[PDB]
Design a protein around this ligand. Structure first.
Ligand code: ATP
Ligand code: CA
Ligand code: CA
Ligand code: CA
Lengths: 364, 125
């Protein structure tokens, strides 16, 4: 862990950080910065704990860095508080959202070199790293986290920017929804401390129905879909059709009053925006990536949903690896570890000579 | 890329086979071609002479049933990198054990063979 590459995967809700060559991130924490309402700041768990006296802020919105001052705190905390490294000693790989604006990629390069003094850095698209982690160079990635959902088709190692789809419906929106319907059932989940409990219920008991209508009817009959959940306070609650109604929103955004098409449609749509000659390869390599793709039953519903949309003779395959909450990070750890990757890094020397614009020619 | 194996790839007609070994591209002894460890991942480059004088390229990354994620991930990346180094002229093919394409199976005149085992993972767990 001395003069070892670092991999930092910055998400809207969670930062995934660690060392290249490890099979998992060493640090996972909330991408949050807390400041005194009225040290000068807290980050991550510390900020969440002292939430009561702090003003919380999320520097990344829908996968895009939006508050540069708060992002430097995140990175500082990542280096010094979580990884316990001297940044100037480690080449650092960062990840970015597909369609990440030009000036944002430059800004990220500048801060790393100018504020953190890294000896080298690199920016890679999150979805591409997920594909690499599943051992593929061609496929279409469904990346869904806490703030954004994207469909990213990739051919022979490179995203097809023209065919990428972005949807501002994800984990946080699902958590908020489960909150609303659960109190609707008779319970009461309103408080931030309660939002946290719901998120845990969302992650532990929810699932995606293979046929939503039948599921609803089957939940109105017996109580074989009902599950119990023990509150922090010891009280037990019974969760019902909400287990599958909450992630249904991914397929029917109308539930939350969103006008967009579901994730099966945006997938079919992204694929249809690609050259006809590669569609078969896309359809047979549907890789699921991120936290909001963890619902049990998600891979079977999408398998069902896209075979219905696609020509009957299309071989369809959904790949939903158990470790897909960390696929992006893992992809980065493999990439940065390769013998052939050493000349890929942007050096401090190259940065001083060319400036932040170097990122557009070195990372694409 | 200045990797020595990159400098050797696609220089002349024939078949080149490399095995992924702890995040590196390691050449396979030519006497061992066709004998694949099912616990490992490999990168195969087939170079054919075109009558136009130019060289045609087919890159195949072969994944054994028991290969670790770092090996399958690296074989895929090495493939992309070898293609780019070859000015994107290579056509990439994913080959999974038991589902290899007729083309790839055809590279091996005495038939491809599977053998249990392989080099250990490169990850730190
Ligand atoms: N088992 C699970 N079931 C459902 N949702 C889950 C599960 N595990 C984690 N999540 C959710 O996934 C989200 C975090 O996932 P992820 O780390 O991939 O997102 P991110 O990178 O922070 O966000 P984004 O990609 O939107 O910028 C949170 O909404 C969390 O509640
Ligand atoms: Ca993410
Ligand atoms: Ca192996
Ligand atoms: Ca090519």
């Amino acid at each position: 862990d001395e003069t070892t590459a670092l991999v930092c995967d910055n998400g809207s809700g969670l930062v995934k950080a660690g060392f290249a060559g490890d099979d998992a991130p060493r640090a996972v924490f909330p991408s949050i910065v807390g400041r005194p309402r009225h040290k000068d700041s807290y980050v991550g768990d510390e900020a969440q704990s002292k939430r009561g006296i702090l003003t919380l802020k999320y520097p990344i919105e829908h996968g895009i860095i939006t508050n540069w001052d708060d992002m430097e705190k995140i990175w500082h905390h990542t280096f010094y508080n979580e990884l316990r490294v001297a940044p100037e000693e480690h080449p650092t790989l960062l990840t970015e959202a597909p369609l990440n604006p030009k000036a944002n990629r430059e800004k990220m390069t500048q801060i790393m070199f100018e504020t953190f003094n890294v000896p080298a850095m690199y920016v890679a698209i999150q979805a591409v790293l997920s594909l690499y982690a599943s051992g593929r160079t061609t496929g279409i990635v469904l990346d869904s986290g806490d703030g954004v959902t994207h469909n990213v088709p990739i051919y022979e190692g490179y995203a097809l920017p023209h065919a990428i789809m972005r949807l501002d419906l994800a984990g946080r929106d699902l958590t908020d929804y489960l909150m609303k319907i659960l109190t609707e059932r008779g319970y009461s989940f309103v408080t931030t401390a309660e939002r946290e409990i719901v998120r845990d219920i969302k992650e532990k008991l929810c699932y995606v129905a293979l046929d939503f209508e039948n599921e609803m009817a089957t939940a109105a009959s017996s109580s074989s879909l009902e599950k119990s959940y023990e509150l922090p306070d010891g009280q037990v609650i019974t969760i019902g059709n909400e287990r599958f109604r909450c992630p249904e929103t991914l397929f029917q955004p109308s539930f939350i009053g969103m006008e967009s098409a579901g994730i099966h449609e945006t997938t079919y749509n992204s694929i249809m925006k690609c050259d006809i000659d590669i569609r078969k390869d896309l359809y047979a390599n549907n890789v699921m990536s991120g936290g909001t793709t963890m619902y049990p039953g998600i891979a079977d519903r999408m398998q069902k949903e896209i075979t219905a949309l696609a020509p009957s003779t299309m071989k369809i395959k959904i790949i939903a690896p158990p470790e897909r909450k960390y696929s992006v990070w893992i992809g980065g750890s493999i990439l940065a570890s390769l013998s052939t990757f050493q000349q890929m890094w942007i050096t401090k020397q190259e940065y001083d000579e060319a400036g932040p614009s170097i990122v557009h020619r070195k990372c694409f | 890329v200045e990797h020595p194996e990159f400098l050797k790839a696609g220089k002349e007609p024939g078949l080149q086979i490399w095995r992924v070994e702890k995040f590196d591209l390691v050449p396979v002894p030519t006497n061992l071609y066709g004998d694949f460890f099912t616990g490992d991942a490999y990168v195969i480059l087939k170079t054919v002479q075109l009558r136009n004088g130019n060289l045609q390229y087919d890159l195949h990354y072969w994944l054994g049933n028991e290969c670790s994620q770092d090996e399958s991930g690296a074989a895929a990346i090495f493939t992309v990198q070898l293609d780019d180094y070859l000015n994107g002229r290579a056509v990439q093919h994913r080959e999974v054990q038991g589902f290899e394409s007729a083309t790839f199976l055809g590279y091996f005149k005495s038939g491809l063979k599977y053998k249990k085992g392989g080099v250990a993972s490169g990850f730190k767990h």
